[PDB]
């Protein structure tokens, strides 16, 4: 009761310390020093510096792809510090921790990505940029459908009107998933997940007393996240067999045998 409340506020505060761009901030921007808008080839060129990228120094779609890759490496880092905060996560065997994060991150990355999306585009560069859904759609095959499925999910997911104190627990539930392939000691993970799923349930009962069957609707979404990952991984296969394209080794470490 008051335990599950104290755990809700714990994860919310960890979430805030761990992720610098929150749904609260993203929504303020999307409904507002406006973001630079990239809607076509020439606006991509004008706004290229908005796209955070650090390297030594070449097709338009590859640069977007690299950009998304660049930022995902950082999302992984963020999610990891967050997991380290979910009570008992650090106490699990250190090989399971790696597997939970391994399969957990894509699901989390796409859940939080929804926060930065509306039906027309996605925030980039900590809200400094806005790249339109239509622009991404126009990129030559197979990069034209790289983002589209993500936008399709986001719109559905955003209609749930979840806020940061809700996603904090939802995200912690996903990490502590009990059916991740190759898990050694499955029991302790599910104990905490059971304890987080009940915390989520109460959090949705108080914070959203009007929207009925949200908890229900929310667990259903958690099944589509996995579908979106599946499509993604399958699409990466195509790209990897036709392009000449390079993947960060933190990402390669996650995709290997996934």
């Amino acid at each position: 009761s008051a335990d599950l409340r104290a755990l809700a506020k714990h994860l919310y505060d960890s979430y805030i310390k761990s992720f610098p761009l929150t749904k609260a901030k993203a929504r303020a921007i999307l409904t507002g020093k406006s973001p630079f808008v990239i809607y076509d080839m020439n606006s991509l060129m004008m706004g290229e510096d908005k796209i955070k990228f650090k390297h030594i120094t070449k097709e338009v779609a590859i640069r977007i792809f690299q950009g998304c890759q660049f930022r995902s490496v950082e999302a992984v880092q963020e999610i990891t510090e967050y997991a380290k905060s979910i009570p008992g996560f650090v106490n699990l065997d250190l090989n399971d921790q790696v597997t939970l994060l391994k399969y957990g991150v894509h699901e989390i990355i796409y859940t939080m990505l929804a926060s930065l999306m509306n039906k027309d585009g996605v925030l980039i560069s900590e809200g400094q940029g806005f790249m339109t859904r239509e622009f991404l759609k126009s990129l030559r095959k197979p990069f034209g459908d790289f983002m589209e499925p993500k936008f399709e999910f986001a719109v559905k997911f955003n209609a749930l009107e979840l806020d940061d104190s809700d996603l904090a627990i939802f995200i912690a539930v996903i990490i502590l998933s009990g059916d991740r392939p190759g898990l050694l000691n499955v029991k302790p993970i599910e104990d905490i997940q059971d304890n987080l799923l009940q915390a989520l349930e109460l959090q949705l009962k108080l914070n959203h007393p009007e929207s009925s069957q949200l908890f229900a609707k929310l667990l259903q979404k958690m099944t589509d996240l996995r579908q979106i990952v599946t499509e993604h991984v399958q699409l990466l296969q195509v790209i990897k067999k036709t392009e000449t394209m390079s993947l960060h080794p933190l990402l390669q470490e996650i995709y290997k045998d996934l």
Binding site: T80, V98, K102, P249, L250
Partner: peptide
């Protein structure tokens, strides 16, 4: 086996 993830957890 997953070196970067390990060092991120350490």
């Amino acid at each position: 086996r997953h070196k970067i993830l390990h060092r991120l957890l350490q």
